[PDB]
Amino acid sequence: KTYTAKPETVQRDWFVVDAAGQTLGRLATEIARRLRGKHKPEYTPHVDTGDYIVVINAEQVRVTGAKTTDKMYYHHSGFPGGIKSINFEKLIAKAPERVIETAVKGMLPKNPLGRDMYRKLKVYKGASHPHTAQQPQELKI
Amino acid sequence: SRVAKNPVKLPAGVEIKLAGQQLSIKGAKGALELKVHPSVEVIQDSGELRFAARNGDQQTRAMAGTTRALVNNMVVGVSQGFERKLQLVGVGYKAQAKGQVLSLSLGFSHPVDYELPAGIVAETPSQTDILIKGIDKQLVGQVAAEIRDFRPPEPYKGKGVRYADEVVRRKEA
Amino acid sequence: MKVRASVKKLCRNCKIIRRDGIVRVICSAEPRHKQRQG
Amino acid sequence: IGVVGRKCGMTRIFTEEGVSIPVTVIEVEPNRVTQFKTEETDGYRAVQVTAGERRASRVTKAQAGHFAKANVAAGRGVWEFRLGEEQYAAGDQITVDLFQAGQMVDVTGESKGKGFAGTIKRWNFRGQDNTHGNSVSHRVPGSIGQCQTPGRVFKGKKMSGHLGAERVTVQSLEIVRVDAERNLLLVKGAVPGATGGDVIVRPAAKA
RNA sequence: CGCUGAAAGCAUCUAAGCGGGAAACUUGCCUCAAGAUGAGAUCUCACUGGGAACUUGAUUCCCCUGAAGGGCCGUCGAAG
RNA sequence: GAUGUCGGCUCAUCACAUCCUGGGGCUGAAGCCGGUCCCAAGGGUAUGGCUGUUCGCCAUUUAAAGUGGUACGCGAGCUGG
RNA sequence: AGGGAAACAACCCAGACCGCCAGCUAAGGUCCCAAAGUUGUGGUUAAGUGGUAAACGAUGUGGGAAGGCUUAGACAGCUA
Fold first, then answer.
1. What's the CA gap between C6 and A113, in Å, rounded?
2. Is the Cβ atom of A110 within 7 Å of strand G at any atom?
3. Keywords of this protein's UniProt record, alphabetized (chain B) (predicted)?
C-alpha cells in the first residue's frame, strides 16, 4: 500500500527570502507552496512537512498600477458600527510586516493545519534576522 | 511643430555638469540648479543642447517636450531674475517689507506677517507694489500666489491684492 | 460649477478639458459657463 | 512625575475678600525612589516611588531583598511614573516642593463603590409610570433590541451591574496652598475616592 | 483653489513634477488591556538526598525530605 | 395540529437622498440677509391645547424642531384608548 | 443518483447489478486554497474594466477607407 509520511521522521529546512521589488501576490504564492510541502515527493495531506521561511525586507515590496493608493483592508471590531478600513499606503508605514502575512494567510487551508503551517512563516521588516544559529540558505533571488 | 526639436543655445558662459542622469547648470547671478530626467536622450554639443527621445509612446513624446522647457528655464534663471508685479488696490491697504518679513495691511483685525521661504527677495518700491526676485519660475510663482490668496479681488470694487495688470473682471453693484 | 450629464461648449471661448478623468468645461470669459461633470 | 498622597477630608477656606473656596486636603508622605528604569534594558523610561510604614512581617523575602538594593526600607504600595527626561539615582525623597500656587494638576483615585446598581442609577434611564394601569414593572428596563432581523442583542448594550470602584481621574484642578511643614497640598475641587484612600497627583496633561 | 508644464509652436492645476484644503479619517485626552496560545519585559527571592526495577529525552517505584511561598481558620472593611 | 393586529411609554440601531453646526463654484450676491447646486453622518434634533389617533390645525419657543429602514423596531418589556 | 454552475428538483453532461489502492474520456478546467500549462504565438485594455444598466455626453485609444489645404509658405502662434 502507498507510503505515508510519519511526523517523527520528517526532515525540515530553513530558507530565506529577499523581497526587494517582488510583486506581492506573485512572491506570496511561492512561499505558500513551500510551506505546505508540494515540492517534496513524500507529501501527505494530513501531516505537515514543510520548510521554515524567513523573509527579511517586508517594506520593500511592490504592487502594480494604481493599487498603492487603493486596496482597503477591511475588518470588523464586533460592536455596532465598528467597520474599519486602511489602505495599502498608510498601512505599510504603520506595520510593514502585516501586509505580507495576511496575503499568505489567505492562500492556505483554514484547518488546524493551516494554523500550524502559518507558524513556520517568520517575516521581518529589518535587514537581518535573529536566526543565524539555524543558518538559512538563500532561495530564488 | 514641436518644441523638442528646437535647441537650447545656452548663452554667455553657463556651465553644464551633466552625468547623464542628473544635469546640473551652474552659472553666475545665482547658481546650483539641477534636474533629473526619467528616460530621454541628452546630447551635449558645442553651445546647444538637443533632447532625443526613446520608445515612441505618448509618454516619451510628452517628456521630451517637458524636459526641454524645464532645462530652458534653468538657463534663463541664472541669466535673468524672475519677477512678478503685484499691485495693491484699495483704501487703507499697504505693504512694507522688513528684511525677510513681508507684513501687510488688508483691513483685517490682526496684521499678517508673511515669511519668504528661501533665497528669494521681495522689494517694495511703493506702499502698493511688490517685486519678487528669484531664480526659478515655479518658486517665484508659488510665493506670489500665496500672497495673492490672502485677499483675492472683487467684482464690485476691486478691493484686494492683484498681480500683473491684466487679471481682473468687474460688474456693477 | 453646474453638474450635468451632458456638457458642451456655449460660446467661442470655452475649451473642453479632461482633468483627472472628468470632462470639465472652463471659460476664459463669463464664469456662468463653468460646467463640471458629463 | 507626580506625588502619591492620601485623601483626608474636605474643608473650606476664605479669601479675605469674602468668597469661599472648597478645598480637598491631601497628606503627602515623602516618597522614596525605589529604582530608576533606564531606556536601554527596559525600553521605556520610568521611576519607582514608594510610600512608607508597613510592618516588617508582611514583606516577603522577594520584596525585602528588592528594597535593599537601595536602602529605601519601604512601606505599602509601589507605583511607577513615566517621565520624559530626568535623573533620579538611588533613593531620593521627592517632596511636595515640586508644586507652586496655580499649577493645574490631575488627580487619580479609585471611587466609592456602589454594589450592584440598576439601570436608573447606573445609566440615568427614566422609568415608567406608577399609576395608570401599570403591572409589576415600575422601574425595570424597557425593551432590548429589534425583532427577527438581527435576532441578537448587540454588544455594548446598557444593562445593569456593579457601579464602580473603578479607576477614575479628575483633570485640571488647581493648587491653593503648598505646606511643607505639615506636608499638605490643598486642591480646589473634588477628588475621587473615599476619605483615607490613595491618590496620585500629576501635573496637568492638557494645560 | 492653484504653481511650473508638455502632448497639441499657443492655451492648459496633469501626463511627469510641486503645494494650500473641512466638525468626517489617523494620532492627541480618560479607561480596560500578554487566553496578544505570537501567552512579552525587568528586579529580587527559594530549593545542592539516596536506592532499585525495567527500556535510558530515561521511565517507574521505595525511603528521607518538604524551602520561597500560598490556602484553610479568626477579627473585620466607606470591598461585597 | 395558532406567525397576538392600530396609537402611547421604555429602550434603541443603521442609511444619507442633510434639518442644524463645518468646508465651499454661481447669483438678477452693495452690506445684513438669501436662492441654488457639489463635499461632509462627528454631536445634536421643543414644551402644550384639541382628537383613539399617526397625521393635522393652532399658541409659544429654538442654532435646528430632518426624511427613511429595523415583522409600517419593540405586548415570554408595560398599557388597552 | 454521479460530475459541472461558489451553495442551486426542472439549466448543461450522463442514466448506478456487485467487487478492484487499474486505464482512456464528456461538459467544465489547469497561479494558491483545489486534481492538471506561472505553455507557445499575434495583437488589444489602465479602468481593477474584467467582476451589474438607459437615453445621452466627450481632443480616451487601436484599425479601415475619405477627402479638404500645403515649401507659389498652409495651419499656430507674435506682429498693424
1. 58
2. yes
3. Ribonucleoprotein, Ribosomal protein, RNA-binding, rRNA-binding
Q: How far apart are CA A75 and CA D6, in angstroms?
A: 45
Write out the H or E segment, with its range, that includes residue B148: helix B137-148
Residues in CB range of B43: below 8 A, 6 or more apart: B49, B50, B52
Can you give the resolution of this entry in Å? 3.3
Chain G footprint bases within 7 A of protein beta carbons:
21, 31-34, 38, 46-48, 55-61
Query: Measured between alpha carbons, how far is D50 from D5 in angstroms, rounded to an integer?
Result: 11
Strand residue runs (E) in chain B: 15-16, 22-26, 33-36, 41-44, 49-52, 85-87, 94-98, 101-105, 113-115, 121-123, 129-133, 162-163
Q: Is B167 helix (H, G, I), strand (E, B) or coil?
A: coil
| Distance in angstroms (rounded) separating the CA atoms of residues A26 and C3 | 43
Q: Closest by alpha carbon to A35, among A124, A104, A98?
A: A104
| Domains in chain B with CATH codes | 15-79 (3.90.930.12), 82-162 (3.90.930.12)
Domain locations in chain A as residue ranges: 1-141
Output the nine-digit C-alpha cell for B49: 543642447
Cell of residue A63, nine digits = 504592487
For residues D4 and D95, the answer to whether their CB atoms sit within 8 Å is no
Residue D48, C-beta contacts closer than 8 angstroms, at least 6 positions apart: D33, D34, D35, D36, D37, D78, D79, D80
Q: Are B87 and B129 in contact (CB under 8 A)?
A: yes
Q: Which residue is nearest to nucleotide E16 (CA to C1')?
A: B63
d(CA D173, CA D207): 10
The rounded radius of gyration (Å) of the Cα atoms in chain A is: 17
Identify the CA nearest to D3 among candidates D36, D40, D49. Answer: D49
Distance CA B97, CA B120 (A): 13
State how beta strands A52-55 and A121-123 pair. Answer: parallel
Q: Is the dihedral of CA D54, D56, D57, D61 positive or negative?
A: positive
Q: Nearest residue on chain A to D152, judged by CA atoms?
A: A80
Three-state DSSP at C33 gives helix
Instruction: Provide the experimental method for this PDB entry.
Output: cryo-EM
Residue matched to cell numbers 535673468: B80
Which residues of chain D does A78 touch, with a Cβ-Cβ cutoff of 8 Å? 155
Contacts for A79 with CB less than 8 Å, ≥ 6 apart: D155, D156
